[PDB]
Design a protein around this ligand. Structure first.
Ligand SMILES: Nc1nc2c(ncn2[C@@H]2O[C@H](COP(=O)(O)OP(=O)(O)O)[C@@H](O)[C@H]2O)c(=O)[nH]1
Ligand SMILES: [Mg+2]
Ligand SMILES: [Mg+2]
Ligand SMILES: [Mg+2]
Ligand SMILES: [Mg+2]
Ligand SMILES: [Mg+2]
Ligand SMILES: [Mg+2]
Ligand SMILES: [Mg+2]
Ligand SMILES: [Mg+2]
Ligand SMILES: [Mg+2]
Ligand SMILES: [Mg+2]
Ligand SMILES: [Mg+2]
Ligand SMILES: [Mg+2]
Ligand SMILES: [Mg+2]
Ligand SMILES: [Mg+2]
Ligand SMILES: [Mg+2]
Ligand SMILES: [Mg+2]
Ligand SMILES: [Mg+2]
Ligand SMILES: [Mg+2]
Lengths: 401, 57, 80, 120, 93
RNA sequence: AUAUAUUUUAGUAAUAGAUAAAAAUAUGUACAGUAAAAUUGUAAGGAAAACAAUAAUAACUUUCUC
RNA sequence: AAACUCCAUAUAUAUAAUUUUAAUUAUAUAUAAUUUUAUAUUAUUUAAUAUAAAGAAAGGAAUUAAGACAAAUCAUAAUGAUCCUUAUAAUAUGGGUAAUAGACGUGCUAUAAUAAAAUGAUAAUAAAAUUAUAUAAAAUAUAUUUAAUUAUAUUUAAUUAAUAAUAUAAAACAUUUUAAUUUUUAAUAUAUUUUUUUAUUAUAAAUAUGAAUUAUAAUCUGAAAUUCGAUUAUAUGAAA
């Protein structure tokens, strides 16, 4: 008893997935570029078209945000938060960050900005938004024999596709291969004719490698090969990113069960192990400017692990595996992860946001009409808990109290 | 038509019955028939002798 | 004693004399666990009112004696 | 559609849960163990199963003491209880509650299905 | 009221054509309580049977010569004769 | 071992004996046989259900044998 | 009757070497209101409405008279009369008070998505009360390959208490999941909705509700758990 047009989903899903961004005012806002941050240092800025294209593919813009409020997802540049982070990324020798903060402070948004910057500066981006998919057991998996770990060839395929599409092909096909690669063919065409697909050293490309389509049991092998290729190449920078890394840290054991009925460890998987290797000084990328940018989510569980990894708490040895996994900490220490605290909004920034919202026509009538502007701003600041952006946004729009 | 109990009773009845379970008649050639007769008669004689022996004893 | 450790429940009885010579054992215990040492001994287990004659088979070995002497009468209704 | 060991299954039915629902011998833990042995990802659906996987499941079910055999064990136990002049056996025969309950009022479920031939 | 199987028309066995009921029988080996085997013709399909309770282990037939199991299993550490002697005072009865 | 085709079986049903005192075709003819009671027993079975057993072999024929 | 009374409230004073700390408290002693004042608007100096300025100022408990109902209690206890005195008095062992056709009250749990379940350790936020016929912390072991959870066992740290323990309150709020529901899944492509979209293929009246009833195994208390107790596990999964 359902039509195509009617809304059948729950609220959060509906807001994400039903395009109510359709009925919205076009806004001629400035464009996000790191080279011209001096112009737009503390102003709202729409992303470039190319950036948007890349960012959507990656999975930067998420469901629980209020990206439905505008024509397209929008951020502002911040001197204390985003700009400083970008400068650190540019300058630091290690280039290896974990974006920490309170729930709703704007970690994702920071990640999205970092991705956009990377896109601008001719870099490949391997984004893993929501590791919950590979960590929790809701897709097929298999123990590979060559690689001593469990591969996940539904998730992997999706990730490969994202990598292919998020990045431009000219940058991606500038990379020649280091080794030759045999794979099992899995086209609808040439199934009987071509039993195997072969990629040569100099002739073939990384783009071509990505476009390969194998059976599930070779997909993990393909992924491994791709990563190796990217590590080897020194022509283009590789930005690796993992958002909701908190889940990964806490969920040490996956929901998958091996032959004997017991839970599989995250490092015994392909994806989680690979990710950990990337984080640590192990799969070292040949080029400079090649970063790993991790991000915590307030959604996920909290425990002693991440604080212990960083310069926060001394290592209590007696706390349990559930609330403190030491292997993960050790791995984090190995690859010198310098954490980045996202600061809460200043008064001026809050005011600027409120002004933008007013321009876009999100503010309620009781806020605008018959009220001093400065007083309103002060109230908004108070209700957000002194500049938590999400909370502020909620007070503005989702209050109706 | 019939219950499961009725079916099982019918099956049981069939086990005992000669309906479609029995082979063809044992036909013999005349020479074979004679051979059979000689086998049986000799056997019968032997049995009689044994009975007499035991009886005598 | 129900729990496997500490078990099983034991009571003093005239067992050996019954074993020697078939003299039924009038139990008023009802909470003594039956043992393998008395299968094929005649027991006369109390019912509240009247002692109940039972010959202990090998299926009874785990159970209590009072489980085989049903105290209440089988219920009925006078349809008036 | 997807038949396995005689019991029919609708598609999109999560395998372990479906197994628990249908087969008499198994609950939650047993179904999970079976899935682990066979190597299905948890929350895999019944429609996703290939034919060899189905056969392997069927084999696993056959190896386990389930369905009619499991039911029979329970029946045998109650028959044994009845055989000895036991209180529990007597209760089973008379269709009253067995587990030291009250029956001045509310003993309707027991009356309905405390038989010697229990399950159906 | 009376439960029956209602008869069909009977098949006419002609005089002389009546054949004796030779039922299908297998030669079945019965091993008794002890190792004494005996062959007997039997209608059930089982070439070999071994018996537990026979005349060859019953006291009546030779005067001159699993609840319990469960109990034994779960009261094994205690080892339960000496125990009988300990728990058998014949004063009270 | 497995697939298709062509067949074959499974409709599972009583009498197996010229049946002989349970019940059923009550008139013909041919062939054959003997009932009942009472008594002694035997799982439920009891005065009363079913089944078993309960007069005599002289002479004769055939067979085996001392 | 009201009032004095108690609890709770506001204020003041006292005391507490601010390690028995919670001073944001506890407890003795006061004071405080059955609130006051003024402007108007209706009805006759007052009384209800409204407005204003002054205040922390707004509840609950106990107390339920006379009579009546020959209301309830001789099973809290006692006493009158009357009856029993080897029994209607006294002690032990077991059984019963838990029986089950129908019926009647009180409750509890349910019949799923403005509602159920997993999870949430720099442990979100309470109060009141108990612990020398005790309260039992941490930690080890088993159920259970990690560990947590829950349940037992092991063994008693601390305190007989503003000091330690019962005891990290729970809803809340947040992520995840949820059949009925082809209102979803997964194979392909697809892309500026990517924890997602579109296209084409295949996905065909009690559940992944409920927890009655029963089977087996363990554990707890006790000397003892059969009639007849309480947990945990693996199955069972009515009715609604
Ligand atoms: N920094 C920043 N954050 C914003 C802006 N606009 C909205 N946000 C909010 O940033 C939030 C993302 O915070 P995040 O740290 O991902 O929350 P978490 O997932 O709970 O950790 C969203 O909820 C947005 O509402 C902006 O212009 N800048
Ligand atoms: Mg986040
Ligand atoms: Mg089931
Ligand atoms: Mg203090
Ligand atoms: Mg008063
Ligand atoms: Mg009065
Ligand atoms: Mg009175
Ligand atoms: Mg009266
Ligand atoms: Mg009196
Ligand atoms: Mg009285
Ligand atoms: Mg008295
Ligand atoms: Mg007396
Ligand atoms: Mg009562
Ligand atoms: Mg519900
Ligand atoms: Mg809490
Ligand atoms: Mg403890
Ligand atoms: Mg305390
Ligand atoms: Mg349920
Ligand atoms: Mg129903």
């Amino acid at each position: 008893r359902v039509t195509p047009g009617s809304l059948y989903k729950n609220w959060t899903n509906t807001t994400h997935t039903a395009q109510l961004q359709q009925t919205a005012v076009p806004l001629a806002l400035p464009i996000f570029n790191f080279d011209d941050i001096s112009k737009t240092l503390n102003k709202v800025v729409s992303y470039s078209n190319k950036q948007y294209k890349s960012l959507h593919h990656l999975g930067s813009f998420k469901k629980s945000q209020f990206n439905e409020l505008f024509q397209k997802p929008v951020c502002l540049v911040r001197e204390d938060a985003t700009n400083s982070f970008l400068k650190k990324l540019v300058s630091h020798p290690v280039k290896k960050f974990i974006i920490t903060g309170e729930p709703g402070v704007g970690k994702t948004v920071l990640l999205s900005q970092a991705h956009a910057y990377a896109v601008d500066s001719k870099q490949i981006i391997i984004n893993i938004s929501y590791p919950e998919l590979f960590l929790n057991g809701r897709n097929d998996f298999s123990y590979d024999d060559d690689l001593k770990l469990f591969i996940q060839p539904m998730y992997l395929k999706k990730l490969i596709r994202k990598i292919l599409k998020a990045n431009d092909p000219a940058l991606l096909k500038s990379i020649e291969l280091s080794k030759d690669y045999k794979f099992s063919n899995a086209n609808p065409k040439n199934a009987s004719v071509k039993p195997f697909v072969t990629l040569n050293k100099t002739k073939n490309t990384v783009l071509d490698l990505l476009s390969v389509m194998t059976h599930p049991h070779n997909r993990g092998k393909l992924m491994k090969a791709i990563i190796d290729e990217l590590s080897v190449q020194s022509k283009v920078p590789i930005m690796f990113t993992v958002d909701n890394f908190s889940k990964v840290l806490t969920t040490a054991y996956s929901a998958y069960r091996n032959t004997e009925n017991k839970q599989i460890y995250s490092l015994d998987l392909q994806m989680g192990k690979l990710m950990m290797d990337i984080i640590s000084g192990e799969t070292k990328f040949a080029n400079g400017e090649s970063s790993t940018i991790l991000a915590i989510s307030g959604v996920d569980r909290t425990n002693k692990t991440l604080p212990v990894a960083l310069g926060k708490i001394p290592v209590d040895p007696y706390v349990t595996r559930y609330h403190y996994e030491p292997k993960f900490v050790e791995l984090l220490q190995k690859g010198n992860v310098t954490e980045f605290e996202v600061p809460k909004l200043n008064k001026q920034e809050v005011n600027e946001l409120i002004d933008y919202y007013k321009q876009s026509n999100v503010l309620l009538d009781k806020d605008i009409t018959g009220k001093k502007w400065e007083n309103l701003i002060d109230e908004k600041y108070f209700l957000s808990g002194n500049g938590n952006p999400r909370e502020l946004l909620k007070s503005l729009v989702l209050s109706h109290r | 038509s019939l219950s499961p109990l009725a079916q099982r009773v019918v099956t049981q009845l069939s086990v005992m019955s000669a309906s479609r379970k029995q082979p063809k008649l044992l036909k013999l050639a005349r020479e074979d028939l004679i051979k059979h007769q000689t086998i049986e008669k000799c056997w019968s004689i032997y049995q009689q002798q044994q009975r007499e022996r035991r009886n005598l004893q | 004693s129900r729990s496997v450790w500490k078990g099983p429940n034991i009571v003093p009885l005239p067992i050996r004399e019954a074993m020697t010579k078939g003299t039924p054992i009038r139990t008023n215990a009802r909470a003594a666990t039956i043992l393998p040492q008395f299968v094929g001994l005649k027991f006369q287990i109390h019912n509240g009112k009247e002692y109940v004659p039972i010959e202990i088979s090998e299926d009874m070995v785990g159970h209590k004696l009072g489980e085989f002497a049903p105290t209440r009468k089988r219920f009925s209704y006078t349809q008036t | 559609v997807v038949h396995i060991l005689g019991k029919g299954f609708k598609g999109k039915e999560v395998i372990k849960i479906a197994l628990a629902s249908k087969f008499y011998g198994i609950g939650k833990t047993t179904a999970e163990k079976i899935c682990s042995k066979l190597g299905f990802y948890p929350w895999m659906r019944m429609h996703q199963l290939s034919e060899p996987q189905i056969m392997s499941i069927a084999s696993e079910l056959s190896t386990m003491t389930i369905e009619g055999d499991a039911r029979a064990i329970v029946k045998d136990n109650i028959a044994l209880k009845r055989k000895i002049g036991s209180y529990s056996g007597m209760r089973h025969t008379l269709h009253l509650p067995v587990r030291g309950q009250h029956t001045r009022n509310n003993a309707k479920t027991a009356r309905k299905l405390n038989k010697i031939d229990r399950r159906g | 009221t009376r439960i029956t199987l209602p008869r069909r028309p009977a098949k006419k066995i002609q005089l002389g054509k009546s054949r004796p009921a030779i039922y299908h029988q297998f030669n079945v080996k019965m091993e008794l309580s002890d190792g004494s085997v005996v062959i007997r013709r039997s209608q059930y399909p089982k070439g070999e049977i071994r018996l537990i309770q026979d005349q060859r282990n019953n006291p009546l037939w030779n005067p001159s010569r699993g609840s319990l199991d469960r109990f034994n299993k779960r009261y094994s550490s205690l080892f339960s004769t000496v125990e009988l002697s300990e728990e058998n005072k014949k004063k009270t009865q």
